[PDB]
Amino acid sequence: MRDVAIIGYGQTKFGELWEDSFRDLIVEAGVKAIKDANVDGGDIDAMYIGNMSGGLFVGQEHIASLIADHAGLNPVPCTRVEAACASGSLALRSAVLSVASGHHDVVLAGGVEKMTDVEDATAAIASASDQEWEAFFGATFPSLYAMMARRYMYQYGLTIEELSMWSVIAHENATKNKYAQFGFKTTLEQVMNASPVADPLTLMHCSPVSDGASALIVCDADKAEEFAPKDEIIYIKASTQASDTIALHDREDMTTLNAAKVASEKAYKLAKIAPEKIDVAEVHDCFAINGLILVEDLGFCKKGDAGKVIDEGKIRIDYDDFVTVNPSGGLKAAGHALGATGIRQVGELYWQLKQDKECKDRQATIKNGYGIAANVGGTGGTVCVHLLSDKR
C-alpha cells in the first residue's frame, strides 16, 4: 500500500473542436501532461482511460488499444474504465490503485470525449440512465435532473433565483479560465429567461455537449521526487467510490446522492480531516441543482441550505470564510466532456493547491491545503471522490 501523488497535468480546450480528431485530442492532452510531469514516454508503465460514449459517438470500442497504438506507447498496457460521466475519476482511481499495488510506478490517467461527431448527443447522454425504465418512457437526461430540482424545491423551498445564481457564478469564474468552453458574463435574468429545456431548468442551467481531453500523471510518492521538486507535488490522500440505484425512481431520497455521502465520508475518514478543512472543491454541476446537492452531501452545509449559501456567494473565490467551489467555472461554464471531466476536476485541484500559473487569475485561498473532487455518473448511480493535499 504505497502513497500516491500527482506529478503532472495536461488538458486541451473544452468545446466544439471540429478540427481536432478524437485521436488527435488525447495525444495533445497526453503530451501536455508528460511535459508538465517532466517524464519521458518510456517512463509510463500503464495507462487508464475514461470514455463513456466510445461506440455511441464513433462506433469504436477497444479505445484503449487505439489510444496506446496512436500515442506510440505500445506495448504498455492500456485499459478503458467506464461509469458514464464519472469515467474520468474512475480512470484515476484505477491508476492510483495500480501504483499503490506496486505493479506500476508511473501511470497516466486520462479521459477523452468527442461528442460533436454524433448528430444527436441526447441518446448517448441518456445511456447513463436506465434504458428500459427511464429512457424508454421518454425521460431525457435533463428531465431527470429537473425532477430532482423539483423535489428539492418542494422539500426545502429553493427558489429558481437561488438555483440560477449557481449559473451566474460559474460563468464569472469561467472568464478566468482559458480552457473553458464559455467565457462570458451572465445575469440572473438571462439565466432564468433562457430557453427552457426541462421545467424548471433552462438552457443556461444545463451543461453543454463538449469535446475535450485531459490527463494526469500519477506516481509513487517517493519516486515523485526524481521527476518533480518537492514543491509542486500533490499527494492523493484518498480515492473512494460508491454506488447508488441507477434509476432516480429507485432512490430512497432523490434530494441527496448517497454514494457521494458514502464516498466523501470515507475520504474524510482516511485523510483524517473534516469538511471544514477543505479550501477548494470541484463538484459535478452538469445541471446546477447537482452542484447544490453535492455541496450539502460533502458536508459544507446543512441539507436544504445550499440555496442560502449560493445567494450570499460563499462559494465564490473572493469569499474568504468558506470553501471555494468550481473555481474553473464547473461543468456548466468550463464545459463537460463526459470522459475527461473527472480528470479535469482533479487537474484543477492540482493547480489550485500547487498555486500553478494556470489558475493564477482564479486562485483560491488555501488556509489548510486540502481539496476534494466529486464526480457523478448519470443521476447518482456512481460517485467517485478524490481528496488531495499539499502535505503527504
Binding piece for Cl ion, criterion CB under 5 A, among 41-49, 95-103, 111-119, 355-363: 41-49
Q: Does 76 interact with its own copies (rule: CB under 8 A)? A: yes
Q: Does 377 interact with its own copies (rule: CB under 8 A)? A: yes
The Cβ of residue 380 has, within 10 Å, a number of other Cβ atoms equal to 30
Q: Least distance (Å) from its own copies to the CB of residue 88?
A: 13
| Closer to its own copies by Cβ: residue 254 or 325 | 254
Per the CB < 8 A criterion, the answer to whether 8 and 36 are in contact is yes
Q: Does 173 interact with Na ion (rule: CB under 5 A)? A: no
| Active-site option among 336, 359, 384, 386 | 336
CA nearest neighbour of 114 among 22, 8, 208, 216:
22
3-state secondary structure of 275: helix
Binding piece for Cl ion, criterion CB under 5 A, among 40-48, 207-215, 226-234, 378-386: 40-48
Q: In what order do the strands lie in the sheet with 234-243?
A: 46-50, 106-114, 211-220, 4-11, 234-243, 382-389, 370-377, 280-283, 324-325
Looking at residues 324 to 363 of the shown chain, list those that interact with Na ion (rule: CB under 5 A).
324
The Cβ of residue 18 has, within 10 Å, a number of other Cβ atoms equal to 9
Residue of 150, 176, 308, 316 that binds another protein (CB under 8 A) = 150
Q: Does 116 interact with its own copies (rule: CB under 8 A)? A: no
Binding piece for another protein, criterion CB under 8 A, among 175-183, 234-242, 243-251, 326-334: 243-251
Q: Least distance (Å) from its own copies to the CB of residue 280?
A: 24
d(CA 307, CA 285): 14
The three grid cell numbers given for residue 369, joined into one nine-digit string: 491545503
Per the CB < 8 A criterion, the answer to whether 23 and 84 are in contact is no
Q: Which residue has the cell 521527476?
A: 227
The three grid cell numbers given for residue 220, joined into one nine-digit string: 509513487
d(CA 18, CA 225): 39
Residue of 52, 148, 198, 388 that binds its own copies (CB under 8 A) = 52
Per the CB < 8 A criterion, the answer to whether 342 and 375 are in contact is yes
Q: Does 339 interact with its own copies (rule: CB under 8 A)? A: no
Q: Does 237 interact with its own copies (rule: CB under 8 A)? A: no
d(CA 87, CA 247): 18
Q: Does 41 interact with Cl ion (rule: CB under 5 A)? A: yes
Q: Least distance (Å) from Na ion to the CB of residue 91?
A: 29
Binding piece for its own copies, criterion CB under 8 A, among 25-33, 78-86, 154-162, 286-294: 78-86
Among its own copies, another protein, K ion, none, what does residue 100 contact (CB within 5–8 Å per kind)?
A: its own copies
Q: Which residue has the cell 447513463?
A: 128
Looking at residues 100 to 119 of the shown chain, list those that interact with another protein (rule: CB under 8 A).
116-117, 119
Q: Does 152 interact with Na ion (rule: CB under 5 A)? A: no
Q: Least distance (Å) from its own copies to the CB of residue 179?
A: 26
> Beta strand 201-202 with 196-198: parallel, antiparallel or unpaired?
antiparallel
Q: Which residue has the cell 456512481?
A: 382
Q: Does 122 interact with its own copies (rule: CB under 8 A)? A: no
Q: Reply yes or no on whether 336 is catalytic.
A: yes
Looking at residues 231 to 290 of the shown chain, list those that interact with K ion (rule: CB under 5 A).
256
Q: Does 184 interact with another protein (rule: CB under 8 A)? A: no
Q: Does 258 interact with its own copies (rule: CB under 8 A)? A: yes
Bridge partners of residue 235, in order along the sequence: 5, 389
| Closer to K ion by Cβ: residue 296 or 348 | 296
Residue of 38, 79, 127, 140 that binds another protein (CB under 8 A) = 140
DSSP 249: G
Helix (H) or strand (E) holding 243: strand 234-243
Q: For 334, list phi and psi in degrees, rounded to 5.
A: -75, -25
Residue of 20, 28, 30, 98 that binds its own copies (CB under 8 A) = 98
Task: Give buried/exposed letters for 156-186 (b at 16+ CB in 10 A, else e).
Answer: bebebebbbbbbbbbbbbbbbbebbbbeeeb
Helix (H) or strand (E) holding 384: strand 382-389
| Closer to its own copies by Cβ: residue 84 or 198 | 84
Give the interface with its own copies as residue ranges (CB under 8 A).
Answer: 1, 46, 52-56, 58-66, 68-69, 73-84, 90, 93-94, 97-98, 100-103, 123-124, 127-132, 135, 239-247, 250, 258-259, 262, 377-378, 381-382, 384
The residues of the shown chain that bind K ion, judged by CB under 5 A, are: 256, 296, 303
